[PDB]
Amino acid sequence: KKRKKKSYTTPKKNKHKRKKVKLAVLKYYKVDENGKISRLRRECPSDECGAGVFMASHFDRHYCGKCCLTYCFN
């Protein structure tokens, strides 16, 4: 019946705010001066993860995000 008074356990956990990125320019690279696009990111080797999807490049490892398939640099 009393108030929670839960100030002992944390000061309110912040929720996640996704950082806003403008476009997907960094993925493709035409700029060959000869209309030759070069893909700056690997693509996924899964069946439902064809040419459209790509795979992220952290300081190590390659990560998909769609099927969560990971290839460590090593």
């Binding site: 997907a24 493709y28 209309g35 030759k36 040419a51």
Partner: protein, 121 residues
């Protein structure tokens, strides 16, 4: 009678919209192009970002897909249904790929045919 490109485009885009297709925005339009599910591309003019338009020409050229260069991207937003709310809202859509044929599986209108007739020459 006369069915010039700037009036058959509205018909074909709408008719696709009833039957899916119409990959709006640079994302998922690049996906349709790379996945080779695209049959027509509609890039809008007056796009400030040069890399945007240059990359979409690159994609269309390498994938050997026709490209229409309309102006006033807001009009493209009207045409692809981004407006809604009677005739308010109106977000710009400066690129769109017509998946599953230029037309759609529902109907094959001659307004689709004028597009390929104009693109053949």
């Amino acid at each position: 009678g006369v069915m010039d490109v700037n009036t058959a485009l509205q018909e074909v885009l709408k008719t696709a919209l009833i039957h899916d297709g119409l990959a709006r925005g640079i994302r998922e339009a690049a996906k349709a192009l790379d996945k080779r599910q695209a049959h027509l591309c509609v890039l809008a003019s007056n796009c400030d970002e040069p890399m945007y338009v240059k990359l979409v020409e690159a994609l269309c050229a390498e994938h050997q897909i026709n490209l229409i260069k309309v102006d006033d991207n807001k009009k493209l937003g009207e045409w692809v249904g981004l407006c809604k709310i009677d005739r308010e809202g109106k977000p710009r859509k400066v690129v769109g790929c017509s998946c599953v044929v230029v037309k759609d599986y529902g109907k094959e209108s001659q307004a689709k045919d004028v597009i390929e007739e104009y693109f053949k020459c």
